[PDB]
């Protein structure tokens with residue numbers, strides 16, 4: 389009735405980023421702003437993959 | 445197979461026969477058949493991707 | 494021969510059309526053959542247990 | 543008592559609305575599809591029921607009694623050739639189900 | 649006012665030195681411009697595009 | 705270069721689009737709401753240039 | 761009041777991250793490159809009455 393379990397979940401692929409970006413919506417949240425726009429990479433002393441390759 | 449690939453194209457690899465369920469051989473050793481393609485080919489796929 | 498210029502967009506113009514319209518999920522791509530084994534025979538005893 | 547086919551179409555409108563609403567909520571639950579298709583085959587509107595079984599096989603293609611009911615509708619309604627197509631597609635997609643092969647060779 | 653109402657000048661109204669308050673409310677506008685442009689943009693986008701029910 | 709226009713041009717445009725109730729200007733109703741998202745920036749550029757009590 | 765204004769100045773001087781050299785955007789040069797904006801020269805009071813009527 390009203391109080392009931394699920395037994396099937398919702399399937400993704402039909403909203404906001406799923407097929408055509410909801411047909412290119414001009415709606416965007418505060419959490420979707422540019423933030424941390426630069427990937428850090430491992431340096432020579434950190435564990436760069438060149439340093440990790442020769443090691444036994 | 446044509447009644448299995450109705451809405452698919454001609455490049456799609458579907459499996460529809462008994463001879464897809466048969467186990468292959470032990471494939472003795474470091475064979476050039478089961479090898480990851482090439483390092484530069486992998487880098488080219490990476491660049492395109 | 495055709496010269497294509499792209500129409501110049503108004504900066505001050507809101508989105509034009511309703512996008513929130515919602516329709517049910519279409520059919521999935523044609524079913525793949527299931528390729529199982531012959532199937533283990535089931536007993537009355539284990540079916541009841 | 544229903545008279546001429548305006549009222550018959552009103553009956554059909556009510557029944558189709560009820561079944562399509564049960565399909566909307568349950569979504570899966572294969573019996574809902576079977577009841578609606580049996581109701582469509584009872585009124586000899588079997589193209590509707592072809593649509594319903596094809597939608598139900600889109601939902602769940604591995605459910606073997608659904609293939610069985612669809613093929614037995616097409617056999618029962620003297621559509622030898624549709625049913626024969628269905629059996630060919632059934633034994634192609636679910637080949638280890640022996641039910642399908644027995645009924646098609648029978 | 650304490651610098652303005654110093655000597656013979658009393659505690660009347662008579663003081664227009666709006667440079668300071670003017671700067672304070674323009675520096676407010678400097679930061680409220682992006683916030684209100686985003687908020688009004690999503691307002692207009694929901695009015696003209698429509699609301700996405702279970703999209704996000 | 706795009707040059708200056710006579711100052712009576714924007715005056716008559718603003719005056720003919722009075723409160724946007726004429727049926728003749730019903731195609732520009734959509735653009736004014738679109739321009740709503742840039743009103744805070746127009747307010748900022750307006751009040752930034754307030755004329756300085758020694759100026760008439 | 762002097763203590764609080766000192767507090768505001770010290771919080772300015774502390775959290776001064778350097779200007780963070782970006783790519784310049786020039787919004788109004790992008791508006792007047794289009795075919796929808798003209799440019800003129802008006803009295804400030806006429807523009808303020810325009811901006812108020814437009815916001816209304």
Ligand SMILES: O=P(O)(O)O[C@H]1[C@H](OP(=O)(O)O)[C@@H](OP(=O)(O)O)[C@H](OP(=O)(O)O)[C@@H](OP(=O)(O)O)[C@H]1OP(=O)(O)O
Pocket residue numbers: 649653658659660661
């Ligand atoms: O009632 P007081 O404690 O003496 O303070 C008032 C008050 O200023 P404060 O808000 O700083 O208390 C008045 O402003 P409001 O009461 O309207 O907020 C202000 O006059 P303005 O209304 O013009 O700001 C007035 O200044 P003045 O008395 O010089 O006219 C000033 O009194 P003091 O100047 O003696 O502090």
